[PDB]
Design a protein around this ligand. Structure first.
Ligand SMILES: O=C(O)c1cccc(O)n1
Length: 115
């Protein structure tokens, strides 16, 4: 509170570290469903059902243009990709499995890099 500050964690390397984690997600072989925005004109249901679409290339653009205020807003967008994937796919499908795989892969890199 006012004039009572918690010790300052070091956030100076966060942009580079998030960028690195994103590069690793972009090059994972199961990334293919998540590389580009879903085409809302062509894919049935998606525009109406998925209220906040998100994909790796949109995350890359936001990161490169200073649109993430901190590392937690970055993690929120990444998780949003996989939450959208669960909403729109059966676990027992290739895209459904890719989502579960990529989430596990991300959360491990996140823990290892920051926690
Ligand atoms: O063909 C599908 O199953 C599909 C298409 C677009 C997005 C998505 O999540 N799934």
């Amino acid at each position: 509170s006012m004039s009572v500050k918690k010790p300052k964690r070091d956030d100076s390397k966060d942009l580079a570290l998030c960028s690195m984690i994103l590069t690793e997600m972009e090059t994972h072989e199961d990334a293919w469903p998540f590389l580009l925005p879903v085409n809302l004109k062509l894919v049935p249901g998606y525009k109406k059902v998925i209220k906040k679409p998100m994909d790796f290339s949109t995350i890359r653009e936001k990161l490169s243009s200073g649109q993430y205020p901190n590392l937690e807003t970055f993690a929120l967008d990444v998780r949003l990709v996989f939450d959208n994937c669960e909403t729109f796919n059966e676990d027992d499908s290739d895209i459904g499995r890719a989502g579960h795989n990529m989430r596990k892969y991300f959360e491990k890199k996140w823990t290892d890099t920051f926690k």
